[PDB]
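Lab notebook, page 48
Experiment: co-folding of the full assembly
Goal: obtain a model of how the components sit together before planning crosslinking
Operator: M.T.
Materials (sequences as entered):
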Amino acid sequence: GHQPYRVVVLSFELLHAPATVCGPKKSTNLVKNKCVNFNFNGLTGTGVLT
Amino acid sequence: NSVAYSNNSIAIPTNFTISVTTEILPVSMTKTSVDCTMYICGDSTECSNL
Ligand SMILES: *[C@@H]1O[C@H](CO)[C@@H](O[C@@H]2O[C@H](CO)[C@@H](O)[C@H](O)[C@H]2NC(C)=O)[C@H](O)[C@H]1NC(C)=O
Ligand SMILES: *[C@@H]1O[C@H](CO)[C@@H](O)[C@H](O)[C@H]1NC(C)=O
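Observation: model returned without errors.
Model output:
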């Protein structure tokens, strides 16, 4: 318990500004006027884009 | 007000009046319907499974 340790703390803030940091993911094209499930910067759902 | 009481006096009307009033009563309300899955889970399916 008395030996030294090393600490690294990572702090995240949620999406309020445009996203800058995130992992690898390929992006497809935009499809509209069709029921489809989407993913915009990490938020999921299902609907129609217009 | 104070009407005068007497043991040898009476009052009798000599003219009438035709009156029309109005009465309002509710009868029915709005018929609604709810969908549990759409209201609670929305588009998710794991929530429906739970
Ligand atoms: C009973 O009441 C009616 C209603 O007010 C009287 O009729 C009115 O009489 C006056 C006076 O002659 C007229 O100016 C009106 O035009 C009449 N009609 C209305 C709708 O007011 C009637 O005269 C009364 N009866 C008695 C015996 O007094
Ligand atoms: C009637 O009324 C008068 C006055 O209120 C009262 O003096 C009398 O006793 C009553 N009865 C009769 C029968 O007059």
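Interpretation: The two ends of chain B are 73 Å apart (CA to CA).
Next step: discuss with group before ordering constructs.
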